[PDB]
Amino acid sequence: DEAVAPLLRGIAVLGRLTGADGGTLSLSALERTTGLARSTVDRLTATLARMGYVRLDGRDVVLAPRLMELGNAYLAALRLPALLSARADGLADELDESVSLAVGDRDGIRFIHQATRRRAMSLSFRIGDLLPAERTAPGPLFAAEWTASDWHRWRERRAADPGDHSFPAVPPREPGAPGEDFARRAAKAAADGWALDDQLIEPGLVAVSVPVRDPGTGRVACVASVVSHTSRHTAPDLRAALLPRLRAAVAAMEDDLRAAPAPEPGPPPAGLALWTGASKQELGREFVESLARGLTVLTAFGEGRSALTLTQVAQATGLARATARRALLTHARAGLVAPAAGHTFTLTPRVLSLGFPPLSRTSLPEIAQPHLTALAERVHESASLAVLADSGEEIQYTARASALPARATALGRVLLALPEVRARGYALVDEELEAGLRAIAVPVRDRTGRVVAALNVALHAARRTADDCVAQILPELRHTADLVETELRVAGRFCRVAVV
C-alpha cells in the first residue's frame, strides 16, 4: 500500500526536464530543482537513460524521443486525436486561423491537438501544454461539469499559486490583474454552449470555443477552439463571424465519434516490463527497477485498452499482482492514473506532462544528430543525413557529423528509390573518382514505411575495398538507421515530424 518512491522521484525528474529550456538540465540543476540527493539523481537518470527516455551528454540530461510513448499511450487510448485531428487541421486551413482541441485536466486545460495559422503575433501552444482553466475559453466549458472536489482543487491551486507560476506556458498573472469571474462564465458557458476568450492569455489573443460531446454519455469529450488575433477580430466579432462554422465543424466531429469503428487493440500484450530484470543484473545499483517497471505500466494502455483492471495490467506487464498494484496506486497519487468504472484504471491527460510538449516539436534532423555523432565515432568516418532538394535531382544535407546530382551520390540514389537500392537496401557510390571519395547510404522510413531521408557514411577509398566497406560499415549504418526509425516511429504517431 506504500507509494513507490523511485517512481515518484523519476516522475519529478521528468517534470523538471519538461519545464526546462531545450528539455535539458545538468545533474547539479536536477539536485537543486528537485531537492533530491545526487546519488538518487544519478541512479534515476541512468535508469531513464536505459529506457531511452533521456540521453546523457556529459553533465547534461536531455529528454529523448522514445519518452513520447508515454504520452502516446494516453492519446491512443483517448481516440479523440486519431478520430478528430484531420477535421481540425482542415478547418484551420479553411479559415487560415488557429484550431485546437483541448481536454479538461483538473484545474487546467491540456491540448490534444494544435494547428496554428497566422499566429506570428501571439503566444502559441503545443500538444500537452497545460493552461489555467480560467484564462481560456475551453475552461468554462469544462468547469460547467465540475464536481465539488473539482472546485476544491481549483480553489486550492488559486490560493497556492496566485501568479499562475505552475503554468509556465502562459505569462504570469500580473499584479492588479482583473478577476476572471470564472464560476459565472462557467454557468453562462453551460447555457450558451460556447465560450469566448477576450485576451485572457495575453493582449491580442482571442478565441471562441465549442464543446465536443461524447455520443455515449453526452458529457464533454473535448473542446474545439478557433484562435485569432484582435487585428482581425475583436472577441465579439470572432464569435459573430466564426461561431456558426465552428458549430458545424463540431457537429461533424460528433458524427465522427458516433460513427467510429470499434478500437483495434492489436495482439495481446505480455511481459512489457520483463526486460528490467536483465538490465538490473547488468547495471546493479545504478538501475532502479521499480522506476522502470512503474513507467512501463503506463505503456500497457492504448487504443482498445483505455480502461484496464489490475489483473489486465499485471498480465500485460508481466509484473506480480502486488507490484502492479503499488505502481498503479503510485500513479494515482501522482495524478497520472485515475480509477474508472468496473474497478478499472485509466490514463489521465497528466501523462502528457512527461516530456511530451517539448518533444512534440522535435524534427528528424534533431532526432538523428546524436545517432550520427555516435555512428561517426564507431567507424571513424563522417556521417550525414539528407533529403531530396526542391529540384528532386539534388540532395540537401539536414544533419552531419564528422570524425552534386542526386544520381551521382549514394544518398541521392537511395532517395530516388533506384532499382539497385530498392533490391539491396543500400547504395555504394565512388562519388569523386580523382579525389577517391566513397560513400554508402541507407534509407530512413517513417512509421508508414515511406522513405523520408537517407543516412550515409563517407570516406576516402584508399586501399579499403568495396566489399570491405560494406562488410564493416553497412552493419553500423543499418543499426543507426534502426535507432532513428524507431524514434521517428514513436514521435510521429501523433505529431508531424519535419524532415528539415
Short mmCIF file of C-alpha atoms in Angstrom, two decimals:
data_model
loop_
_atom_site.label_atom_id
_atom_site.label_comp_id
_atom_site.label_asym_id
_atom_site.label_seq_id
_atom_site.Cartn_x
_atom_site.Cartn_y
_atom_site.Cartn_z
CA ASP A 1 0.00 0.00 0.00
CA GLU A 2 3.05 2.26 0.24
CA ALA A 3 4.00 4.55 -2.62
CA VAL A 4 6.88 3.57 -4.91
CA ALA A 5 9.33 6.35 -4.05
CA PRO A 6 11.69 5.97 -7.06
CA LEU A 7 8.68 6.09 -9.38
CA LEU A 8 7.50 9.36 -7.84
CA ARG A 9 11.03 10.78 -7.93
CA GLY A 10 11.52 9.74 -11.55
CA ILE A 11 8.23 11.44 -12.42
CA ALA A 12 9.50 14.59 -10.68
CA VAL A 13 12.78 14.44 -12.62
CA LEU A 14 10.91 14.15 -15.92
CA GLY A 15 8.64 17.03 -14.92
CA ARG A 16 11.59 19.31 -14.20
CA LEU A 17 13.22 18.40 -17.53
CA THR A 18 9.94 19.09 -19.33
CA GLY A 19 9.85 22.62 -17.92
CA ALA A 20 13.49 23.39 -18.74
CA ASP A 21 14.69 25.14 -21.87
CA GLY A 22 15.59 22.60 -24.53
CA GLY A 23 14.35 19.86 -22.22
CA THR A 24 17.85 19.84 -20.73
CA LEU A 25 19.21 20.16 -17.20
CA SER A 26 22.56 19.40 -15.65
CA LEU A 27 22.82 16.82 -12.88
CA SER A 28 23.55 19.66 -10.44
CA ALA A 29 20.50 21.58 -11.64
CA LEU A 30 18.38 18.47 -11.05
CA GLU A 31 19.74 18.34 -7.49
CA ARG A 32 18.79 21.97 -6.89
CA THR A 33 15.36 21.91 -8.54
CA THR A 34 14.18 18.56 -7.14
CA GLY A 35 15.94 18.66 -3.77
CA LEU A 36 16.99 15.04 -4.32
CA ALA A 37 20.38 13.72 -3.29
CA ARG A 38 22.99 13.47 -6.02
CA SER A 39 23.22 9.69 -5.63
CA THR A 40 19.47 9.48 -6.24
CA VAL A 41 19.62 11.83 -9.24
CA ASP A 42 22.43 9.73 -10.74
CA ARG A 43 20.52 6.45 -10.37
CA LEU A 44 17.18 7.79 -11.62
CA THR A 45 18.68 9.43 -14.72
CA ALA A 46 20.77 6.35 -15.53
CA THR A 47 17.59 4.27 -15.31
CA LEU A 48 15.72 6.73 -17.54
CA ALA A 49 18.64 6.63 -20.00
CA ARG A 50 18.44 2.82 -20.17
CA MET A 51 14.77 3.21 -21.12
CA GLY A 52 15.72 5.73 -23.81
CA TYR A 53 13.62 8.42 -22.11
CA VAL A 54 16.62 10.71 -21.56
CA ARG A 55 20.04 10.98 -23.16
CA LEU A 56 23.18 11.68 -21.13
CA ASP A 57 25.50 14.28 -22.69
CA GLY A 58 28.36 14.83 -20.26
CA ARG A 59 26.89 16.62 -17.25
CA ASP A 60 23.59 17.28 -19.07
CA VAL A 61 20.38 15.22 -19.08
CA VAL A 62 18.29 15.62 -22.25
CA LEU A 63 14.74 14.43 -22.89
CA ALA A 64 14.73 11.81 -25.65
CA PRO A 65 12.06 10.95 -28.25
CA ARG A 66 11.17 7.45 -27.00
CA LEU A 67 9.71 9.09 -23.88
CA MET A 68 6.81 10.15 -26.13
CA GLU A 69 5.47 6.58 -25.91
CA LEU A 70 4.02 7.55 -22.52
CA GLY A 71 2.01 10.44 -23.94
CA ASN A 72 1.25 8.29 -26.99
CA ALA A 73 -0.45 5.75 -24.71
CA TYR A 74 -2.89 8.35 -23.38
CA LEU A 75 -3.52 9.87 -26.82
CA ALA A 76 -4.10 6.42 -28.33
CA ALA A 77 -6.45 5.35 -25.53
CA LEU A 78 -8.32 8.67 -25.79
CA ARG A 79 -9.08 8.03 -29.51
CA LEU A 80 -10.09 11.68 -29.98
CA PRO A 81 -6.70 12.62 -31.57
CA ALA A 82 -6.89 9.91 -34.25
CA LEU A 83 -10.58 10.49 -34.95
CA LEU A 84 -10.74 14.31 -35.00
CA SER A 85 -7.30 15.75 -35.86
CA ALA A 86 -7.88 15.57 -39.63
CA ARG A 87 -11.06 17.65 -39.44
CA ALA A 88 -9.39 20.12 -37.07
CA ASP A 89 -6.45 20.56 -39.44
CA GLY A 90 -8.87 21.01 -42.33
CA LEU A 91 -10.77 23.76 -40.52
CA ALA A 92 -7.52 25.59 -39.75
CA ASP A 93 -6.53 25.51 -43.43
CA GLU A 94 -10.03 26.58 -44.50
CA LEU A 95 -10.19 29.55 -42.12
CA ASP A 96 -6.45 30.32 -42.18
CA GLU A 97 -6.82 30.55 -38.40
CA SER A 98 -5.54 28.50 -35.47
CA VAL A 99 -7.62 25.48 -34.42
CA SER A 100 -7.05 23.40 -31.29
CA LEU A 101 -8.64 20.58 -29.31
CA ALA A 102 -8.37 20.51 -25.52
CA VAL A 103 -9.44 18.25 -22.66
CA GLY A 104 -10.06 19.04 -19.02
CA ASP A 105 -7.05 18.35 -16.77
CA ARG A 106 -8.12 19.11 -13.18
CA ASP A 107 -7.92 22.92 -12.65
CA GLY A 108 -6.41 23.36 -16.13
CA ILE A 109 -6.90 22.52 -19.78
CA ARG A 110 -4.45 20.47 -21.82
CA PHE A 111 -4.19 20.38 -25.61
CA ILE A 112 -4.56 17.15 -27.58
CA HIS A 113 -4.34 18.86 -30.99
CA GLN A 114 -2.80 22.08 -32.31
CA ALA A 115 -2.91 23.64 -35.79
CA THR A 116 -1.69 27.24 -35.77
CA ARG A 117 -2.23 29.68 -38.66
CA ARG A 118 -1.33 33.39 -38.91
CA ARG A 119 -0.03 33.14 -35.34
CA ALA A 120 3.20 35.17 -35.53
CA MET A 121 1.96 37.98 -33.26
CA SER A 122 0.82 35.78 -30.37
CA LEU A 123 1.90 33.07 -27.98
CA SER A 124 1.17 29.57 -29.29
CA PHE A 125 0.99 26.22 -27.55
CA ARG A 126 1.87 22.58 -28.16
CA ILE A 127 0.17 19.24 -27.66
CA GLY A 128 0.45 18.50 -23.95
CA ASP A 129 0.74 22.13 -22.83
CA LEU A 130 -1.30 22.96 -19.72
CA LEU A 131 -3.08 26.29 -19.26
CA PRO A 132 -5.04 27.62 -16.27
CA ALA A 133 -8.71 26.96 -16.95
CA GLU A 134 -9.99 30.42 -16.02
CA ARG A 135 -7.68 32.11 -18.57
CA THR A 136 -9.04 30.17 -21.57
CA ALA A 137 -12.28 29.76 -23.49
CA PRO A 138 -12.41 25.94 -23.06
CA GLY A 139 -12.03 26.43 -19.29
CA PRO A 140 -15.62 27.47 -18.51
CA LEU A 141 -17.00 24.67 -20.69
CA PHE A 142 -15.17 22.00 -18.66
CA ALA A 143 -15.95 23.68 -15.33
CA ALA A 144 -19.67 23.56 -16.15
CA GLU A 145 -19.45 19.82 -15.40
CA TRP A 146 -17.12 20.09 -12.39
CA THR A 147 -17.87 18.28 -9.14
CA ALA A 148 -17.37 19.70 -5.65
CA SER A 149 -13.90 18.15 -5.45
CA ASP A 150 -13.02 19.74 -8.80
CA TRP A 151 -13.91 23.18 -7.45
CA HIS A 152 -11.93 22.47 -4.28
CA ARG A 153 -8.86 21.58 -6.36
CA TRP A 154 -9.30 24.80 -8.34
CA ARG A 155 -9.61 26.90 -5.17
CA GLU A 156 -6.56 25.21 -3.63
CA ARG A 157 -4.45 25.97 -6.71
CA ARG A 158 -5.72 29.56 -6.83
CA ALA A 159 -4.54 30.25 -3.27
CA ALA A 160 -1.28 28.30 -3.56
CA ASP A 161 -0.26 29.73 -6.96
CA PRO A 162 -1.65 33.28 -7.21
CA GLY A 163 0.61 34.17 -10.16
CA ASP A 164 -0.03 31.08 -12.33
CA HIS A 165 3.65 30.17 -11.95
CA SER A 166 2.73 26.47 -12.07
CA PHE A 167 1.66 27.10 -15.70
CA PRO A 168 4.95 28.20 -17.32
CA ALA A 169 3.41 28.09 -20.81
CA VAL A 170 1.46 31.32 -20.16
CA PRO A 171 2.72 34.70 -18.90
CA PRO A 172 2.46 35.01 -15.10
CA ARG A 173 -0.68 36.66 -13.77
CA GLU A 174 0.39 40.29 -13.45
CA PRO A 175 -0.19 42.35 -10.29
CA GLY A 176 -3.56 44.05 -10.40
CA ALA A 177 -4.96 41.55 -12.89
CA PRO A 178 -8.77 41.71 -13.02
CA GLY A 179 -10.83 38.84 -11.71
CA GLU A 180 -11.62 36.20 -14.31
CA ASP A 181 -15.18 35.73 -12.97
CA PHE A 182 -14.81 32.02 -13.60
CA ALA A 183 -17.84 30.42 -11.92
CA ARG A 184 -20.17 32.90 -13.64
CA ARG A 185 -18.53 32.26 -17.02
CA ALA A 186 -18.89 28.51 -16.43
CA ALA A 187 -22.62 28.88 -15.76
CA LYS A 188 -23.03 31.03 -18.87
CA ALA A 189 -20.99 28.55 -20.93
CA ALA A 190 -23.31 25.69 -19.99
CA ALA A 191 -26.30 27.79 -21.07
CA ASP A 192 -24.71 29.15 -24.26
CA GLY A 193 -22.97 26.00 -25.46
CA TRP A 194 -19.92 28.13 -26.34
CA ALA A 195 -17.40 30.40 -24.66
CA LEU A 196 -15.21 33.39 -25.56
CA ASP A 197 -11.63 34.27 -24.60
CA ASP A 198 -11.05 38.04 -24.75
CA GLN A 199 -7.28 38.30 -24.29
CA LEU A 200 -7.14 36.26 -21.09
CA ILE A 201 -3.74 34.79 -22.03
CA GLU A 202 -2.15 38.00 -23.35
CA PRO A 203 -3.08 41.16 -25.29
CA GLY A 204 -4.29 40.47 -28.81
CA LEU A 205 -5.06 36.75 -28.42
CA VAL A 206 -8.76 35.89 -28.80
CA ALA A 207 -10.56 32.56 -29.13
CA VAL A 208 -14.04 31.06 -29.38
CA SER A 209 -14.73 27.54 -28.13
CA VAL A 210 -17.44 24.90 -28.55
CA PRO A 211 -17.59 21.57 -26.66
CA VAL A 212 -17.50 18.24 -28.49
CA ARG A 213 -19.91 15.91 -26.71
CA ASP A 214 -19.32 12.19 -26.33
CA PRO A 215 -22.20 10.43 -28.14
CA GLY A 216 -22.34 7.71 -25.49
CA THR A 217 -22.56 9.80 -22.31
CA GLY A 218 -23.46 13.25 -23.63
CA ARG A 219 -20.70 14.77 -21.49
CA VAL A 220 -17.89 16.92 -22.88
CA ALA A 221 -15.29 14.80 -24.67
CA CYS A 222 -13.10 17.72 -25.75
CA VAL A 223 -13.40 21.39 -26.71
CA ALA A 224 -12.64 22.79 -30.17
CA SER A 225 -11.37 26.37 -30.39
CA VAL A 226 -10.81 28.84 -33.22
CA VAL A 227 -7.97 31.16 -32.20
CA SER A 228 -7.44 34.55 -33.84
CA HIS A 229 -5.92 37.98 -33.19
CA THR A 230 -7.55 41.32 -32.39
CA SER A 231 -6.12 42.82 -35.59
CA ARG A 232 -8.55 40.52 -37.44
CA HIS A 233 -11.41 40.06 -34.94
CA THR A 234 -12.41 41.50 -31.64
CA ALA A 235 -13.64 38.80 -29.29
CA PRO A 236 -17.31 39.69 -30.02
CA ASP A 237 -16.62 39.85 -33.77
CA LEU A 238 -14.80 36.50 -33.69
CA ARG A 239 -17.97 34.95 -32.25
CA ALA A 240 -20.26 36.61 -34.80
CA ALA A 241 -18.05 35.67 -37.75
CA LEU A 242 -16.89 32.14 -36.97
CA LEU A 243 -19.10 30.54 -34.30
CA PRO A 244 -21.55 29.13 -36.92
CA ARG A 245 -18.70 27.50 -38.86
CA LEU A 246 -17.20 26.12 -35.63
CA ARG A 247 -20.57 24.71 -34.57
CA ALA A 248 -20.79 22.97 -37.95
CA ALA A 249 -17.29 21.54 -37.54
CA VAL A 250 -18.12 20.34 -34.02
CA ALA A 251 -21.32 18.72 -35.30
CA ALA A 252 -19.26 16.75 -37.84
CA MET A 253 -16.76 15.80 -35.13
CA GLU A 254 -19.59 14.38 -33.03
CA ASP A 255 -20.79 12.48 -36.11
CA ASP A 256 -17.28 11.06 -36.45
CA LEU A 257 -17.28 9.97 -32.80
CA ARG A 258 -20.71 8.37 -33.28
CA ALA A 259 -19.59 6.53 -36.44
CA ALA A 260 -16.16 5.45 -35.19
CA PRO A 261 -15.45 1.73 -35.65
CA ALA A 262 -14.53 -0.40 -32.67
CA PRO A 263 -10.97 0.26 -31.45
CA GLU A 264 -8.21 -2.08 -32.57
CA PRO A 265 -6.16 -3.16 -29.51
CA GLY A 266 -3.66 -5.22 -31.51
CA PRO A 267 -2.18 -8.51 -30.35
CA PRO A 268 -2.47 -9.39 -26.65
CA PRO A 269 0.50 -7.84 -24.83
CA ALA A 270 2.61 -9.81 -22.39
CA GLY A 271 5.73 -9.15 -20.33
CA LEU A 272 6.14 -5.48 -21.20
CA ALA A 273 8.25 -5.00 -18.05
CA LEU A 274 10.18 -8.29 -18.11
CA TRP A 275 13.29 -6.72 -19.67
CA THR A 276 14.07 -4.85 -16.43
CA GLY A 277 15.40 -7.98 -14.72
CA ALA A 278 18.25 -8.38 -17.20
CA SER A 279 19.04 -4.66 -17.01
CA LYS A 280 19.17 -4.85 -13.21
CA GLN A 281 21.63 -7.75 -13.48
CA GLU A 282 23.84 -5.81 -15.90
CA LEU A 283 23.75 -2.41 -14.18
CA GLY A 284 23.40 -3.22 -10.48
CA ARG A 285 22.95 -0.28 -8.12
CA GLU A 286 22.79 2.28 -10.95
CA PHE A 287 19.50 0.86 -12.30
CA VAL A 288 16.34 1.35 -10.23
CA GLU A 289 13.97 -1.40 -11.36
CA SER A 290 10.84 -0.09 -9.60
CA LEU A 291 11.07 3.13 -11.64
CA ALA A 292 11.50 1.29 -14.95
CA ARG A 293 8.70 -1.14 -14.07
CA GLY A 294 6.44 1.67 -12.87
CA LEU A 295 6.72 3.76 -16.02
CA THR A 296 6.26 0.65 -18.19
CA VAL A 297 2.84 0.23 -16.54
CA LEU A 298 1.70 3.32 -18.45
CA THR A 299 2.50 1.64 -21.78
CA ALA A 300 0.01 -1.16 -21.07
CA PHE A 301 -2.73 1.32 -22.00
CA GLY A 302 -3.61 2.29 -25.55
CA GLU A 303 -6.22 2.10 -28.28
CA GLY A 304 -8.79 -0.50 -27.32
CA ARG A 305 -7.06 -0.69 -23.91
CA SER A 306 -8.21 2.54 -22.29
CA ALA A 307 -9.62 1.07 -19.05
CA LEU A 308 -7.80 -1.93 -17.56
CA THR A 309 -8.26 -3.98 -14.41
CA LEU A 310 -5.39 -4.73 -12.06
CA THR A 311 -5.40 -8.28 -13.46
CA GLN A 312 -5.06 -6.96 -17.01
CA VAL A 313 -2.26 -4.56 -16.04
CA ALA A 314 -0.35 -7.37 -14.33
CA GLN A 315 -0.86 -9.67 -17.33
CA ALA A 316 0.23 -7.04 -19.87
CA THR A 317 3.41 -6.11 -17.97
CA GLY A 318 4.34 -9.49 -16.50
CA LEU A 319 4.58 -7.90 -13.05
CA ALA A 320 3.48 -9.60 -9.86
CA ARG A 321 -0.01 -8.52 -8.87
CA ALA A 322 1.11 -6.68 -5.73
CA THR A 323 3.89 -4.93 -7.67
CA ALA A 324 1.49 -3.78 -10.39
CA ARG A 325 -0.92 -2.57 -7.70
CA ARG A 326 1.69 -0.41 -5.96
CA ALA A 327 2.73 1.12 -9.29
CA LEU A 328 -0.88 1.95 -10.17
CA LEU A 329 -1.56 3.42 -6.73
CA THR A 330 1.63 5.47 -7.01
CA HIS A 331 0.48 6.73 -10.42
CA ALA A 332 -2.86 7.64 -8.83
CA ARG A 333 -1.04 9.73 -6.22
CA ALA A 334 0.90 11.49 -8.99
CA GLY A 335 -2.36 12.06 -10.89
CA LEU A 336 -1.27 10.00 -13.91
CA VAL A 337 -3.86 7.23 -13.40
CA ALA A 338 -7.48 7.58 -12.29
CA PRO A 339 -9.99 4.92 -11.21
CA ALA A 340 -12.67 4.09 -13.75
CA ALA A 341 -15.92 2.15 -14.00
CA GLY A 342 -15.84 -1.55 -13.21
CA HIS A 343 -12.83 -1.37 -10.87
CA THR A 344 -10.55 -0.36 -13.75
CA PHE A 345 -7.78 2.20 -14.18
CA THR A 346 -7.32 4.75 -16.95
CA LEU A 347 -4.63 7.20 -18.02
CA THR A 348 -5.18 10.89 -17.35
CA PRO A 349 -4.08 13.81 -19.57
CA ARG A 350 -1.46 14.49 -16.87
CA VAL A 351 0.63 11.75 -18.54
CA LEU A 352 1.38 14.30 -21.27
CA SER A 353 3.34 16.27 -18.66
CA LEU A 354 6.09 13.64 -19.02
CA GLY A 355 8.13 15.33 -21.73
CA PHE A 356 5.52 15.46 -24.49
CA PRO A 357 5.14 19.22 -25.28
CA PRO A 358 8.84 19.92 -25.98
CA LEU A 359 9.42 16.54 -27.65
CA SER A 360 6.42 17.01 -29.95
CA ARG A 361 8.42 19.69 -31.81
CA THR A 362 11.50 17.52 -32.45
CA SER A 363 12.49 17.43 -36.12
CA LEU A 364 14.00 14.43 -37.88
CA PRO A 365 17.50 16.02 -38.08
CA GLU A 366 17.25 16.71 -34.35
CA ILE A 367 16.34 13.05 -33.77
CA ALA A 368 19.24 11.86 -35.91
CA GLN A 369 22.01 14.21 -34.73
CA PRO A 370 23.19 12.26 -31.63
CA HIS A 371 23.00 9.00 -33.60
CA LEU A 372 25.01 10.50 -36.46
CA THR A 373 27.68 11.56 -33.96
CA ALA A 374 27.77 8.08 -32.42
CA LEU A 375 27.94 6.41 -35.84
CA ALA A 376 30.78 8.69 -36.95
CA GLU A 377 32.77 7.65 -33.87
CA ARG A 378 32.09 3.93 -34.28
CA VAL A 379 33.57 3.85 -37.81
CA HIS A 380 35.88 6.92 -37.54
CA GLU A 381 34.38 8.45 -40.69
CA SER A 382 31.88 11.21 -41.44
CA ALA A 383 28.14 10.56 -41.41
CA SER A 384 25.31 12.64 -42.83
CA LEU A 385 21.53 12.85 -43.16
CA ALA A 386 19.89 14.22 -46.30
CA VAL A 387 16.65 14.65 -48.24
CA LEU A 388 15.90 15.50 -51.85
CA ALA A 389 16.28 19.17 -52.71
CA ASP A 390 13.49 21.20 -54.31
CA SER A 391 14.50 20.11 -57.82
CA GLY A 392 14.16 16.43 -56.92
CA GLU A 393 17.51 15.79 -58.64
CA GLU A 394 19.86 17.18 -55.97
CA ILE A 395 20.35 16.26 -52.33
CA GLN A 396 20.05 18.61 -49.36
CA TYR A 397 22.02 17.91 -46.19
CA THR A 398 19.98 18.30 -43.00
CA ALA A 399 22.38 16.95 -40.34
CA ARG A 400 26.06 15.98 -40.34
CA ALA A 401 28.74 14.56 -38.07
CA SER A 402 32.48 14.45 -38.75
CA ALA A 403 35.37 12.46 -37.31
CA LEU A 404 26.19 17.17 -56.98
CA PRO A 405 23.31 15.48 -58.86
CA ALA A 406 21.33 13.04 -56.75
CA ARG A 407 22.02 10.21 -59.21
CA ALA A 408 25.77 10.67 -58.66
CA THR A 409 25.69 10.17 -54.87
CA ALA A 410 24.89 7.26 -52.59
CA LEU A 411 22.44 9.43 -50.65
CA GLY A 412 20.70 10.53 -53.84
CA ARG A 413 20.39 7.04 -55.30
CA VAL A 414 18.75 5.97 -52.04
CA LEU A 415 16.44 9.00 -52.03
CA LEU A 416 15.45 8.43 -55.67
CA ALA A 417 14.50 4.80 -54.90
CA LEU A 418 16.60 3.49 -57.77
CA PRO A 419 16.40 -0.21 -58.79
CA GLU A 420 19.61 -1.48 -57.19
CA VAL A 421 18.92 0.40 -53.95
CA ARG A 422 15.39 -1.00 -53.70
CA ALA A 423 16.74 -4.53 -54.10
CA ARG A 424 19.78 -4.41 -51.81
CA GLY A 425 18.59 -1.80 -49.31
CA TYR A 426 21.69 0.38 -49.74
CA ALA A 427 23.83 2.20 -52.29
CA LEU A 428 27.62 2.34 -52.56
CA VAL A 429 28.98 5.03 -54.88
CA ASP A 430 32.51 6.16 -55.65
CA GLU A 431 31.34 9.76 -55.84
CA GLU A 432 34.62 11.59 -56.62
CA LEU A 433 37.00 9.48 -58.69
CA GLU A 434 40.05 11.77 -58.80
CA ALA A 435 39.80 12.51 -55.06
CA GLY A 436 38.84 8.94 -54.13
CA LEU A 437 35.66 9.75 -52.19
CA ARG A 438 33.40 6.76 -51.47
CA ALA A 439 30.03 6.73 -49.72
CA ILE A 440 27.46 4.17 -48.58
CA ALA A 441 23.86 5.09 -47.80
CA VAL A 442 20.65 3.50 -46.49
CA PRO A 443 17.06 4.80 -46.38
CA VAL A 444 15.20 6.23 -43.40
CA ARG A 445 11.48 5.45 -43.34
CA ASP A 446 8.69 6.95 -41.24
CA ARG A 447 6.05 4.88 -39.43
CA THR A 448 4.12 4.48 -42.70
CA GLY A 449 7.10 2.86 -44.43
CA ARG A 450 7.66 5.86 -46.72
CA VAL A 451 11.29 6.82 -47.32
CA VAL A 452 11.70 10.33 -45.89
CA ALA A 453 15.51 10.74 -45.71
CA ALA A 454 18.81 8.91 -46.21
CA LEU A 455 21.78 8.21 -43.93
CA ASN A 456 25.30 7.77 -45.28
CA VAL A 457 28.91 7.22 -44.28
CA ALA A 458 31.52 8.97 -46.42
CA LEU A 459 35.21 8.10 -46.54
CA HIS A 460 38.26 8.00 -48.80
CA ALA A 461 38.50 4.81 -50.85
CA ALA A 462 42.21 4.27 -50.00
CA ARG A 463 43.08 0.54 -50.06
CA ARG A 464 39.81 -0.49 -48.34
CA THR A 465 37.91 -2.45 -50.99
CA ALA A 466 34.20 -2.05 -51.65
CA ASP A 467 33.40 -5.42 -50.06
CA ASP A 468 35.43 -4.26 -47.06
CA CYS A 469 33.44 -1.04 -46.67
CA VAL A 470 30.16 -2.94 -46.98
CA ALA A 471 31.19 -5.70 -44.57
CA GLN A 472 32.37 -3.24 -41.90
CA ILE A 473 30.35 -0.03 -42.35
CA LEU A 474 26.93 -1.21 -43.55
CA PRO A 475 26.07 -3.12 -40.32
CA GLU A 476 26.77 0.02 -38.28
CA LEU A 477 24.87 2.17 -40.78
CA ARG A 478 21.84 -0.13 -40.61
CA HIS A 479 21.96 -0.10 -36.80
CA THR A 480 21.98 3.70 -36.76
CA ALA A 481 19.08 3.78 -39.23
CA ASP A 482 17.14 1.38 -36.98
CA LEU A 483 17.61 3.65 -33.96
CA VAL A 484 16.49 6.73 -35.91
CA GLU A 485 13.47 4.98 -37.43
CA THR A 486 12.35 3.73 -34.01
CA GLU A 487 12.43 7.23 -32.51
CA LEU A 488 10.82 8.65 -35.66
CA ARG A 489 8.14 5.95 -35.36
CA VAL A 490 7.22 6.89 -31.78
CA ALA A 491 7.50 10.65 -32.27
CA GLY A 492 5.45 10.60 -35.47
CA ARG A 493 2.49 8.63 -34.12
CA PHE A 494 0.54 11.78 -33.16
CA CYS A 495 2.95 14.55 -34.21
CA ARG A 496 4.01 15.89 -37.61
CA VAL A 497 7.80 15.45 -37.67
CA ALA A 498 9.56 17.83 -40.05
CA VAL A 499 12.31 16.35 -42.23
CA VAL A 500 14.30 19.62 -42.41
#
